[PDB]
Write a protein that binds this ligand. Structure first.
Ligand SMILES: NC(=O)C1=CN([C@@H]2O[C@H](COP(=O)(O)OP(=O)(O)OC[C@H]3O[C@@H](n4cnc5c(N)ncnc54)[C@H](O)[C@@H]3O)[C@@H](O)[C@H]2O)C=CC1
Ligand SMILES: NC(=O)C1=CN([C@@H]2O[C@H](COP(=O)(O)OP(=O)(O)OC[C@H]3O[C@@H](n4cnc5c(N)ncnc54)[C@H](O)[C@@H]3O)[C@@H](O)[C@H]2O)C=CC1
Ligand SMILES: NC(=O)C1=CN([C@@H]2O[C@H](COP(=O)(O)OP(=O)(O)OC[C@H]3O[C@@H](n4cnc5c(N)ncnc54)[C@H](O)[C@@H]3O)[C@@H](O)[C@H]2O)C=CC1
Ligand SMILES: NC(=O)C1=CN([C@@H]2O[C@H](COP(=O)(O)OP(=O)(O)OC[C@H]3O[C@@H](n4cnc5c(N)ncnc54)[C@H](O)[C@@H]3O)[C@@H](O)[C@H]2O)C=CC1
Ligand SMILES: NC(=O)C1=CN([C@@H]2O[C@H](COP(=O)(O)OP(=O)(O)OC[C@H]3O[C@@H](n4cnc5c(N)ncnc54)[C@H](O)[C@@H]3O)[C@@H](O)[C@H]2O)C=CC1
Ligand SMILES: NC(=O)C1=CN([C@@H]2O[C@H](COP(=O)(O)OP(=O)(O)OC[C@H]3O[C@@H](n4cnc5c(N)ncnc54)[C@H](O)[C@@H]3O)[C@@H](O)[C@H]2O)C=CC1
Ligand SMILES: NC(=O)C1=CN([C@@H]2O[C@H](COP(=O)(O)OP(=O)(O)OC[C@H]3O[C@@H](n4cnc5c(N)ncnc54)[C@H](O)[C@@H]3O)[C@@H](O)[C@H]2O)C=CC1
Ligand SMILES: NC(=O)C1=CN([C@@H]2O[C@H](COP(=O)(O)OP(=O)(O)OC[C@H]3O[C@@H](n4cnc5c(N)ncnc54)[C@H](O)[C@@H]3O)[C@@H](O)[C@H]2O)C=CC1
Lengths: 134, 138, 138, 134, 134, 138, 134, 138
């Protein structure tokens, strides 16, 4: 019922914006306040924080969400560490953006519920769209 | 019916793999052979080429395709340059991956038929999956 | 006759300064006021604007100029996007600074009337000055 | 009569190419051998070296040139240190690319013979060309 | 029966040296050849390579060892990625040096057989030594 | 019987935890309270102090201990300075963690009773475990 | 009569402290406010600022001093650029710490009044002290 | 009477050069020959050596000197280790360059006869020159 998104890059940003457009409540989190303010209006609660710190996480009240999307990209370690902490906080559904096959491998082992490869997935979706038009 | 994909990265290679899996003919193209070879088995043809070269584009007889997808990456000029080229070859449908906002607008004016923003686009689809977990009866 | 320079950096500002010094009318334009202000005294008019915005371009009545020089910097798309825009306004002469090789070819196809490569171009003039020290009778 | 160019960037590179096209002999130097080889054909003697080291300079036979163009850009320190060494080696004509007003200022003090601001100079050249066409 | 050690820092270096002193055969691997040569004499087969690359790994003939110690320290990602690849190559016993609790957590999940915290373990061993002396 | 550990990092804190678990009295000491507090429950006493300060060392009545372990980290001088200090207090046994080779030799001459190299030392123990898997009958 | 010191490192710091101990007024400037506050008590007017920016310089009231010591060390460029600006502001006495022979060379050209090599100068001072004791 | 300087960097080399210039005998010593050679002409003898090695120290017959200056650089342990070594040789006067505060206190306890802080020390002399411009009658 509740949606939280950590990592306001192109992916997470897009996700927070749609959820908002569909009239849902979203908790948008990100380290540098640049982003956190750029999505303040498109979110129900924008917060500057570091997902890799358990304390900032609990103070964030993250265990009160059923769906937490980790959209941190470049930094595989932060991404990995974050989903690991979330798994401990016992979040029911944690979806994570993966950067490659191995990042994907460990995410599985750590316990991620859904691993997303944005560019690859879009590619298969685009190829399908191509068939669907002669 | 005729499909050509230029730029075999995560996006492009992923569409070539899907078209193949559904039994469609696909011409895969890239600048380095490592990429070209790694997709030979997933495409009716995997050619090595620099799409920015109008002569190399003619060698591939690229004009015989109805759908060309430009999926070049980092090099934004490479992308718009390629799509400018195959647009003077009268290609019916040119779909291009857009790097950012200014890229999108220029591609729009260049005459691209469809513009894709991999991250953003997948972004709303995921948000739709999430939304469904609340709006739909489940 | 009338001259408009978009992008008041080293190159653009330097051309605005020279046209002024020779008593020509010049419309200087840039996104940040610091730049715009610092050229107010060297141009008949210095306006703050984002050349990528087609509405902002119309506000400047940019279509009343025969010569428009696009001297945007680092942001290569900003440059080609601007060039594309003012080419839709039928501007007679559009001169543009080219960042690199792919930018030059794109600009060429976009319809730019003249392409400048500051570093390379000044580069041959310098080489010519040096050559004169040997070839010319001195 | 003799021309040497240190710093095969856009500016220096272009300068080595014209001199070659005009059929003159040039000594093209640069630190990373990428460039040094890319201009091997367009120069009379391409050499990998560091202009900021007096020894690599003397071993380069630098004092046998009448005109030395220091085309190092980004690195203001290297650029400055280089013309400084050259001035000691007593080169008759040393022309240097300057990055800004202050870089320019110290180049005068160090003894540079001609200071070039590629973009600015081209700008005035371009404006003149603009008048010359109605 | 066979011992391989990837990561010739203070820890792995020490491990390779003892095994050698006990007259055992060891395969010492490390990226920068500085180390690889510094342990050439103290090892049965020193090799310059990157544990994070499957190819350099197979070409290393690593699946021919029963015990592989990953002693990469600072770089948690390389450490993690390495033990992950090894697990796929199906090495029977892979012992890894962990940098902290979380690094340790994922190493478990990835499938490490023994996780070592050098400084902490030594501390408990030192405290025991202290009791054992009045 | 009397145990004191200075420097509550991975090494030092780990020895304090072990001594406690075996029911020994331990005086834990460090410069920042976060460290001191996090070990209060594992030591008969957790004091905040800068071991380099000879006056702060006397306040702790450190001279009443037979075994003092210097486990300061990165700051190599801090380590040798501390061990120089408690050596002029006539402490019977001073065990110190050595940062490297020159540190070891200087500690040796300073009068340290036992020198520990955490990484190297654990290194040979692990190699011994491995060796046993071959030399011992298993 | 007026003393200003830019660059509160070991050298500059020490210089601000003595002048203060001798009961003189000093203007101590430095970029990172760590230092600027650490010398607040030992100076007559500590200020956070960047010597390489003319505006921060004039706003600093720099041209009201007869002696300005540029004690910036590592950053040769900043050091050089700074004495260059000061020379323009027309400071009567500008003493600069030099990092090496060449840094020293350009400082002369720029117009520095006294160039100091702390370690070398101390070395000769120490040798003299050595003779003076049998 | 006789002087030995270990560590021929800016500080050490500069003291070797001055003693030479005043006609005093000086034994310069350093680990790399480039340094040793470059001071051969400014000293009665320039030897290559690692002062941390007690055997190398004896080879130099360093015990025949009344004044030994330790001017090793960055490697702080190298400095204190050397100081410790030649203090076991009963050298009458040992002057050492101190890197920082903890190094000074250690050196102090090690038995160094004089501690120099090049930057800070030159720092007060400069401040004194400046002060003289106000306090002295000029
Ligand atoms: N970052 C850049 O400037 C560029 C990135 N790219 C590519 O884009 C791809 C990734 O796209 P994006 O997600 O848009 O980039 P990104 O890596 O910048 O986005 C991740 C987002 O996560 C946030 N984040 C990182 N660590 C965090 C932490 N501990 N706690 C909370 N938030 C944290 C960042 O602030 C950022 O907004 C990569 O493959 C990269 O190579 C391409 C060009 C430029
Ligand atoms: N692969 C990398 O090193 C980096 C990728 N990124 C970002 O990661 C995201 C996903 O990466 P990809 O787009 O898959 O990587 P990519 O940019 O390498 O993919 C483009 C593909 O097009 C090919 N290509 C490039 N110029 C070509 C030309 N003129 N003719 C024919 N083929 C040509 C390339 O070889 C490549 O396989 C992108 O948004 C990208 O900007 C950011 C930094 C580095
Ligand atoms: N200024 C900088 O921070 C850097 C400059 N460079 C390079 O240095 C060289 C010389 O620098 P410049 O070109 O003078 O610097 P520049 O790139 O800032 O100059 C372009 C000028 O156009 C203005 N501009 C940018 N987008 C605009 C828009 N949409 N509408 C109107 N005005 C717009 C900018 O504010 C600026 O005054 C260039 O080749 C550049 O690529 C490289 C790195 C950084
Ligand atoms: N370097 C870059 O990636 C970019 C530079 N720019 C702009 O381009 C302008 C300068 O253009 P370029 O000259 O092409 O760039 P550049 O600074 O890379 O070229 C200078 C040349 O000097 C050589 N060099 C540097 N130190 C040397 C040394 N000690 N001995 C011998 N050779 C040495 C370099 O290898 C290089 O080829 C600047 O205003 C900069 O802001 C804009 C975009 C990217
Ligand atoms: N590296 C340094 O200069 C210093 C490290 N430390 C501390 O020391 C601790 C770690 O100690 P060490 O293991 O001795 O340091 P370390 O991190 O340098 O040693 C790891 C060893 O693994 C090797 N290695 C790294 N990536 C590799 C790869 N992909 N394939 C093969 N070999 C690879 C390295 O060459 C190195 O010899 C850390 O907690 C660190 O903070 C303290 C001071 C300095
Ligand atoms: N913790 C860090 O940020 C880094 C650690 N390393 C290396 O990681 C390895 C393991 O780390 P540790 O030694 O556990 O870390 P550490 O160096 O922080 O541990 C020493 C402990 O002694 C305390 N301490 C320091 N000076 C003191 C003084 N004067 N009086 C009283 N207590 C004092 C510190 O607060 C700390 O808890 C070491 O070999 C270290 O060199 C390398 C780089 C950074
Ligand atoms: N910085 C370091 O961590 C170390 C430096 N050293 C050596 O110490 C010597 C220099 O000693 P210090 O002066 O103490 O070092 P330093 O270079 O850090 O001190 C210079 C001072 O100038 C200030 N400064 C720099 N740029 C400035 C600007 N634009 N405006 C205002 N203030 C500015 C800095 O904040 C600093 O306090 C060098 O030979 C260096 O190799 C040795 C070890 C460490
Ligand atoms: N030279 C460099 O790369 C750096 C110097 N600095 C700082 O710059 C300042 C001035 O530099 P210097 O002290 O002159 O440089 P330095 O540290 O190299 O000078 C010490 C001299 O002692 C010699 N030496 C070192 N260990 C020795 C041993 N065991 N036996 C005999 N000789 C030995 C060295 O080869 C050198 O000639 C210092 O405060 C230093 O900490 C800071 C960073 C780097």
């Amino acid at each position: 019922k509740q949606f939280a998104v950590i990592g306001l890059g192109r992916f997470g940003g897009s996700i927070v914006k749609e959820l908002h457009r569909m009239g849902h409540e979203v908790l948008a989190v990100d380290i540098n306040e640049e982003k956190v303010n750029a999505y303040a209006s498109y979110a129900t609660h924008a917060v500057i924080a570091n997902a890799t710190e358990e304390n900032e996480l609990l103070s964030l009240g993250i265990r009160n969400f059923e769906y937490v999307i980790v959209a941190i990209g470049a930094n595989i370690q932060a991404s990995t560490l974050t989903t690991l902490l979330l798994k401990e906080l016992d979040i029911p559904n944690i979806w994570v953006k993966a950067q490659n096959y191995y990042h994907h491998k460990v995410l599985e082992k750590i316990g991620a519920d859904r691993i997303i490869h944005p560019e690859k997935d879009m590619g298969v979706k685009i190829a399908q769209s191509l068939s669907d038009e002669n």
